[PDB]
Design a protein around this ligand. Structure first.
Ligand SMILES: CCCC[C@H](NC(=O)[C@H](C)NC(=O)[C@H](CCC(=O)O)NC(=O)[C@H](Cc1ccccc1)NC[C@H](CC(C)C)NC(=O)[C@@H](NC(=O)[C@@H](N)CCCNC(N)=[NH2+])C(C)C)C(N)=O
Lengths: 99, 99
């Protein structure tokens, strides 16, 4: 699709068997999902933005379907106010900015 | 241009006669620039990021060039980690997200 930016670029994702709404975020290096259980091992990480930092759990090799497109990579899980799809997974679905 | 996302989508902007670097940020409603002087009065705004809320100075009808494209609109000034071009000005330069 071509997504205009009049409104927040929200899409449906599937992760860990659950459907969620997530924000396609070119200003995020990483993907961060509201706290949930994911399979396998994790390690703690600090991620920052406006307002400072939060502690998250890092899971590697996680598969997410993003608007019907399958991607795999690192997914961080923690107290984010919004589900965020960052560049590490946007690249995998071939996402580009165009103007 | 068509911008892939393997690196941060950084561009050159020009605002108040100064060249700066800023991030094209589909995950931002608003445009936030690190502290600088802008003409006119400002008004208060609280903005939220992944870490919490911060107060910024809101300046309306600011002229800004973004990767060679002219925009005129609201610019928030405050402590952002990185200068960010949000959807309010991304729409003005005709930017879309494609995959
Ligand atoms: C129209 C105006 C509405 C009024 C106002 N609106 C807002 O506050 C809206 C919701 N906030 C936003 O739009 C803000 C940008 C600020 C702004 O636009 O004002 N967007 C954001 O903060 C979005 C995520 C988000 C989206 C919506 C809500 C909350 C959060 N991320 C933008 C931010 C830009 C960064 C360069 C500073 N990116 C990040 O924070 C990402 N972090 C990173 O990419 C790493 N660099 C951080 C890790 C560093 N440490 C390390 N690697 N060890 C994070 C998503 C993983 C309000 N008060 O409600």
């Amino acid at each position: 699709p071509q997504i205009t930016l009049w409104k927040r670029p929200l899409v449906t994702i599937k992760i860990g068997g659950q459907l969620k709404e997530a924000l396609l975020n070119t200003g995020a290096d990483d993907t961060v999902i509201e706290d949930m259980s994911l399979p396998g091992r994790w390690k703690p990480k600090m991620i920052g933005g406006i307002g400072g930092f939060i502690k998250v759990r890092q899971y590697d090799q996680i598969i997410i379907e993003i608007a019907g497109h399958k991607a795999i990579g690192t997914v961080l899980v923690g107290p984010t106010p919004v589900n965020i799809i960052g560049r590490n997974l946007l690249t995998q679905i071939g996402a580009t900015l165009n103007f």
